[PDB]
Amino acid sequence: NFDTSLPTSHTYLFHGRTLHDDDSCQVIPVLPQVMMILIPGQTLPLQLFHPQEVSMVRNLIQKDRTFAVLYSEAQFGTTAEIYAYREEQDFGIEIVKVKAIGRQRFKQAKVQILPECVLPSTMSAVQLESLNKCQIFSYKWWQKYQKRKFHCANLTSWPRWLYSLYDAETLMDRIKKQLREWDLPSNPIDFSYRVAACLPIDDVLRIQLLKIGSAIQRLRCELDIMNKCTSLCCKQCQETEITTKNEIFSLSLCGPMAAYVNPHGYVHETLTVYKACNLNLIGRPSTEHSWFPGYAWTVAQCKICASHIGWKFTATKKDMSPQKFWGLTRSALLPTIP
């Protein structure tokens, strides 16, 4: 195949340890002209040109090295921490390139950290003391798990199989099988945020999971989308099918979707799929600043409305795997239940 670790290292373009404790009030910079909904753990590359910004970062290195990313204007956002930085002055154009990663959700910005709401198991309240000793333990293993972990359901008014539908470990596995389908973290908090950034949804649905504070409600709601959103259409003209779930595959290590900068600093969360229909290709395949080294990109736009949906990527070697794939920018898509 191809090096699945190449796209996440942003080759085409630091021990991070500053966290703010929950519910605090912090004053954090917000970068001009950045528009995206950023998720804890999601990776964000940037390219800044105005000396305003270039000053903010050069001095931002001192202390926090963390800025705020925000829109419906904006009620919530997420702190992003710079983990890598180069100051390039090539062609006589001073550019500052940074790679930040989302850390904390919050409600210069006066900003209140939103706590990640962590709850014990459904059983930690009703668990028999005698059975405490048994709480630590190819799919019958899950029937065993269900029978032994949720044994004390018999003390309550609902069955084992209900408490199972709110069990982080179980839910993560149910999500995993779909994530396996087109080939991750162990902490439910992390898992729910990793697949949140993988899920190709629209700005209004992304704010929903961001508003969700609990891992359990995040994983559950995330399972709904994965069943209910089989098709993906052109956002502009609405009624035009571009690709399906079947075609989604994770070319990048992080997932089928990550954030990528073009040379002018615009961020594109592009989704890698094998097949894509009803697109026209314009211009000539080019490797200049390609986010997938080895492939050339050609601009693809919706057959009907001409609105730029993403790019078709083609191999440059005749021995490469996934010789042709489509990369679709998330802002251009609309999930549909056919």
């Binding site: 073009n262 002018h264 314009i282 601009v299």
Partner: peptide
């Protein structure tokens, strides 16, 4: 074709043609 859009990569020949496409963003 040295005039390129700042979002997708679409190339044009005249500066006015680029302004036509960018207005669609």
């Amino acid at each position: 074709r040295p005039f390129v859009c700042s979002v997708c990569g679409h190339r044009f020949t005249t500066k006015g043609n680029l302004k036509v496409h960018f207005h669609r963003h």
